[PDB]
Amino acid sequence: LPTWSLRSRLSLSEVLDSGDLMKFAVDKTGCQFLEKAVKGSLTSYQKFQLFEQVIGRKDDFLKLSTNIFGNYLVQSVIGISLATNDDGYTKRQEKLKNFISSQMTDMCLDKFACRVIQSSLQNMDLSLACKLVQALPRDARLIAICVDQNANHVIQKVVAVIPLKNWEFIVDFVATPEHLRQICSDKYGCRVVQTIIEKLTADSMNVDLTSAAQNLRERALQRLMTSVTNRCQELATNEYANYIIQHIVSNDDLAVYRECIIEKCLMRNLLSLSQEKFASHVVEKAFLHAPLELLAEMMDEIFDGYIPHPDTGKDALDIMMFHQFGNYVVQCMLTICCDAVSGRRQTKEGGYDHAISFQDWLKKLHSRVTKERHRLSRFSSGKKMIETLANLRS
RNA sequence: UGUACCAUA
C-alpha cells in the first residue's frame, strides 16, 4: 500500500486520482475498501476513471482478473460499465470482449479469471457474450477446460446463458468418440456432459423455444446420444460416467434413449452388470424406469436367461441375492413388484393392465426367498427382503 | 452390505 494512504475516512476519488489503484485492488484491506466504495453513488468521472484503470488496459485488466482479490473489483466495474449507457459504452464493452477473447483459455483455466468470464457471459449484451464463446479453443485445450475443476464452470455457464447455435461446436467436439472417452472418464468432464444433456432435453424448461430452435436442439441431442449409446458399455461401468447413463435411463423426457440403452447395452448383460460396482446402479435404474415390455424381458432374463451352474445348480438369482453389489438389484426387483401389487405403482401401461405379470414375478421371488430364508436371514439384504414380503401381506 | 459433482476475499 502507498505510504500516503497508510487510514480510515479515505475517499474513492483520492485512490482514483493517485495512480495507485492497482496497489489497493490486490491488497485484501484495500480491495475491501474499493468494493464498498464502488457500490455507492458514483459520479460520471469516477466511473470514467474506474473504467480506464480497471478494465481499460489489457494488462492491468489481466492482472486483476487473475488476482484473488482483484477479480471481484473487475466484476463490479464490468457491472457498472454495463449499467452506464453513456457514449463510451460501446467501446468499453467491445474492448472488454477483445481482452477476454485474446486470452480465453488462460482465463478459463485460472481459478479467479474464470469467475470474470462467467460474470461477463451472463451480464454482457448477448451479442457480445456470443463472441466470447467463439473465442473458445477447438482442440486439446477444450478438453483441458472441460476437466479442470474451475474452468469446467465456464462451459456450464455458456450452456446456461448462451443460445445453442453459438455453442453447437462444443456438442460436436464432445461427441467426437475420442473426446467423449476422455471427458466422460473425468470427475468434472462428466458434470459438463450432464449439463449439456439437460440443456438439450425437451423438458418443461425448454417450452419457450421456437420450433426452429427445438429442431436445432433435437439434432444436437441425437448427435450426442449417438456417441453416448455407442460407448454405453464403457460409460455405464465407469466410476463417473455411470451417473450420466443413470440420468438418461431415469429421465422420461429421454425415454427413447433409455430404451436404446436398455436394448443394446443392458439386455443380455444383466447378471454380469449387476455384479459391477458402478453399473449395478445403472441396472437398478433400468428396472425402475423400463417400459413394461422391456421390464418383462429384464425380469425374464434374471429368472430364466442363464444356465445354472453345472455342478451346484446355482442360478443367476442365487448368485445375485448374495452378491456384494447384485443383492441391491434383487432388492430393487422385489420392491418394484411389491409396489405394483399394492397400488404404489401403475400397472396399466397405456390402458393395458400388466398386473398379473407383476404377480407372477412376485410369486417367483417370494418362492425363492421362502426356500432360502435361512441363508438369507444371515444378511442385511436378506432380512430386508424377508421384511419387504412380510410388510406386503400386512 | 455398494459410487461422483455442487468450484473464489
Nearest nucleotide by C1' position to the A385 CA atom: B1
For residue A113, the number of C-alpha atoms closer than 13 Å in the C-beta half-sphere is 18
User: Among A300, A214, A308, A307, which Cα is nearest to A253's?
Assistant: A214
What resolution, expressed in A, was reported for this entry?
A: 2.4
Nearest nucleotide by C1' position to the A31 CA atom: B9
Assigned superfamily of A1-394: Leucine-rich Repeat Variant (1.25.10.10)
Cα torsion angle, A361, A363, A368, A370, sign: positive
Residue for grid cell 487473475: A66
- Residue closest to B4 C1′ by Cα: A240
Q: Which residues are A353's β-sheet partners?
A: A348
Distance, in Å, from the CA atom of A63 to the CA atom of A48, rounded to the nearest integer, reads: 20
Report yes or no: A265 and A233 within 8 Å, Cβ to Cβ: yes
The backbone torsions φ and ψ at residue A348, rounded to the nearest 5 degrees and listed phi first, read -85, 95
The backbone torsions φ and ψ at residue A75, rounded to the nearest 5 degrees and listed phi first, read -65, -40
- Residue closest to B2 C1′ by Cα: A325
Locate A70 and state its grid cell: 482483484
Distance, in Å, from the CA atom of A81 to the CA atom of A55, rounded to the nearest integer, reads: 9
Residue A347's alpha-carbon distances to A9, A337, A338, in angstroms, are 73, 10, 11
Residue A219's alpha-carbon distances to A93, A179, A202, A216, A223, in angstroms, are 33, 19, 12, 5, 6
Residue A384's alpha-carbon distances to A148, A334, A337, A387, A388, in angstroms, are 42, 10, 15, 5, 6
Distance, in Å, from the CA atom of A222 to the CA atom of A302, rounded to the nearest integer, reads: 31
Between CA A231 and C1' B1 the distance (Å) reads 30
Distance, in Å, from the CA atom of A388 to the CA atom of A165, rounded to the nearest integer, reads: 51
User: What is the distance, to the nearest Å, from the Cα of residue A150 to the centroid of all Cα atoms in its chain?
Assistant: 14
Distance, in Å, from the CA atom of A320 to the CA atom of A303, rounded to the nearest integer, reads: 11
Q: What residues have CB less than 8 Å from A333, skipping those under 6 apart?
A: A287, A299, A302, A361, A365
- Residue closest to B7 C1′ by Cα: A150
User: What is the distance, to the nearest Å, from the Cα of residue A293 to the centroid of all Cα atoms in its chain?
Assistant: 30
The backbone torsions φ and ψ at residue A274, rounded to the nearest 5 degrees and listed phi first, read -65, -15
Cα torsion angle, A159, A163, A166, A170, sign: positive
Q: HEC string of chain A?
A: CCHHHCCCCCCHHHHHHHCCHHHHHCCHHHHHHHHHHCCCCCCHHHHHHHHHHHHCCHHHHHHHHCCCCHHHHHHHHHHHHHHCCCCCHHHHHHHHHHHHHCCHHHHHHCCCHHHHHHHHHHHCCHHHHHHHHHCCCCCHHHHHHHHCCCCHHHHHHHHHHCCHHHHHHHHHHHHCHHHHHHHHCCCCHHHHHHHHHHHCCCCHHHCCCCHHHHHHHHHHHHHHHHHHHHCHHHHHHCCCCHHHHHHHHHCHHHHHHHHHHHHHHHCCCHHHHCCCCCHHHHHHHHHHHCCHHHHHHHHHHHHHCCCCCCCCCCCHHHHHHCCCCHHHHHHHHHHHHHHHHCCCCCCECCCCECHHHHHHHHHHHHHHHHHCHHHHCCCHHHHHHHHHHHHHHC
Between CA A292 and C1' B9 the distance (Å) reads 55
Nearest nucleotide by C1' position to the A151 CA atom: B7
Between CA A66 and C1' B7 the distance (Å) reads 16
Q: Return the amino acid letter for A123.
A: N
Report yes or no: A327 and A334 within 8 Å, Cβ to Cβ: no
Report yes or no: A144 and A109 within 8 Å, Cβ to Cβ: yes
Nearest nucleotide by C1' position to the A119 CA atom: B8
- What are the domain boundaries of chain A? 1-394
Residue A182's alpha-carbon distances to A67, A133, A146, A222, A279, in angstroms, are 30, 22, 10, 20, 19
Distance, in Å, from the CA atom of A324 to the CA atom of A274, rounded to the nearest integer, reads: 10
Mark the nucleotides of strand B covered by protein, meaning any atom under 7 Å from a CB.
Answer: 1-9
Q: Which residues of A62-86 are buried (b: 16+ CB within 10 A; e: fewer)?
A: bebbbbebbbbbbbbbbebbbebee
The torsion defined by the Cα of A67, A70, A72 and A75, in degrees rounded to 10, comes to -100
* A45-49 contacts, C-beta under 8 A, 24 or more apart: A46/A12, A46/A13, A46/A16, A47/A80, A47/A81, A47/A84, A49/A16, A49/A17
Nearest nucleotide by C1' position to the A381 CA atom: B1
Q: What residues have CB less than 8 Å from A344, skipping those under 6 apart?
A: A338
Distance, in Å, from the CA atom of A291 to the CA atom of A263, rounded to the nearest integer, reads: 11
Between CA A43 and C1' B6 the distance (Å) reads 40
**Cβ within 7 Å of nucleic strand B, residues:** A 28, 31-32, 35, 68-69, 71-73, 75, 111-112, 114-115, 118-119, 149-150, 153, 187-188, 190-191, 194, 239-240, 242-243, 246, 277-278, 280-281, 284, 324-325, 327-329, 331, 379-381, 384
Nearest nucleotide by C1' position to the A384 CA atom: B1
Q: Return the amino acid letter for A9.
A: R
Cα torsion angle, A122, A123, A126, A128, sign: negative
